[PDB]
């Protein structure tokens, strides 16, 4: 039995859980209408969480509302924060969010999300407020993809594709179950390291000794060069390319790499970053890296990228 073990690694918010969900959609018939119903509350919760996160950031970043009236909605939001913990988003709550998301001050703060920590499901949910606020609303599969869930252990998914048995593990941030956790690192066919390209312009936070991209690099450096992984494919998912492309128009890559003398085209930057990662591989004669530029929330893109990742696996054990 040729059985394939895949381990997802990468900093938090790099798209790991999304890739997992994406395998369920692409290779395991997705989510049934029942399951979609179960994420109703999650969608509502994340929406509430997302708008709160911006509101709270306004206080810290010292940004006034566009219209002074919104102060009431801010106060109203915290009162109503729990309203959706079952089913409906009351009409009253939807208007609060609608009016806040509209406001010029809130927006200025949303533009400045590099200056704090705003999740990338935020605008997806908020721009579709009108749609999700209907009482009859059933989450679409794209809505489920965009859900942000706390996990407290190892996430696993399994499927059969091209006559091969795939087991994929997103080992969490919790070693609160070692051994099973350590095992996820054992007998791996391919490691898939995710990088949020769009982190390149994030401000150096007060709890960091280097920016997020270099943290991702340091991490990749150690995975890539670990003697345990000599016989394991290293696959690099430079992810969030959609966001990266928009950002790079405005924020120079020199923000992330001061020494960078290239240009702020999507093409030239993405290539520079790839090089920064791939140069970390210190065994180039005995190992090569498989870089892919992905948008993990885009089912069609992932299908294609994963299809290609599989083709290499097939062509691999036909040699070895």
């Amino acid at each position: 039995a040729k059985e394939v073990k895949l381990l997802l690694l990468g900093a938090g918010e790099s798209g790991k859980s999304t890739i997992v969900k994406q395998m369920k959609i692409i290779h395991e018939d997705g989510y049934s209408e029942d399951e979609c119903k179960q994420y109703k509350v999650v969608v509502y919760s994340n929406t509430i969480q997302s708008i709160i996160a911006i509101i709270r950031a306004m206080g810290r970043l010292k940004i006034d509302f566009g219209e002074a009236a919104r102060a009431d909605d801010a106060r109203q939001l915290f009162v109503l924060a729990g309203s959706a913990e079952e089913g409906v988003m009351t009409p009253e709550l939807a208007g609060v969010i609608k009016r806040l998301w509209r406001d010029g001050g809130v927006q200025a703060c949303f533009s400045r999300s590099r200056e704090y920590l705003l999740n990338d499901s935020a605008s997806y949910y908020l721009n579709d407020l009108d749609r999700i606020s209907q009482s009859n609303y059933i989450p679409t599969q794209q809505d489920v993809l965009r859900t942000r869930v706390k996990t407290t252990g190892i996430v696993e998914t399994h499927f059969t594709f091209k006559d091969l048995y795939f087991k994929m593990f997103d080992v969490g941030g919790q070693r609160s179950e070692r051994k099973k956790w350590i095992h996820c690192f054992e007998g791996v066919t391919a490691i898939i390291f995710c990088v949020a390209l769009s982190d390149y312009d994030l401000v150096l936070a007060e709890d960091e000794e280097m920016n997020r991209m270099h943290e991702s690099m340091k991490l990749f450096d150690s995975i890539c060069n670990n003697k345990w992984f000599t016989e394991t494919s290293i696959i690099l998912f430079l992810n969030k390319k959609d966001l990266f492309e928009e950002k790079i128009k405005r924020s120079p890559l020199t923000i992330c790499y001061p020494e960078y003398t290239g240009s702020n085209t999507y093409e030239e930057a993405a290539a520079y970053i790839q090089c920064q990662f791939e140069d970390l591989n210190r065994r180039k004669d005995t190992k090569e890296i498989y870089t892919h530029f992905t948008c993990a929330t885009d089912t069609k893109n992932v299908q294609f990228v994963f299809d290609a990742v599989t083709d290499v696996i097939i062509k691999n054990n036909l040699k070895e």
């Binding site: 999740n119 941030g173 991702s216 995975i223």
Partner: peptide
């Protein structure tokens, strides 16, 4: 190597006030 630690620390930093339990 402190290799397992480094990973543990990295992947845990994922905006928990903006995620929800299931």
């Amino acid at each position: 190597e402190d290799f397992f630690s480094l990973i543990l620390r990295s992947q845990a930093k994922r905006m928990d006030e903006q995620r929800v339990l299931l």
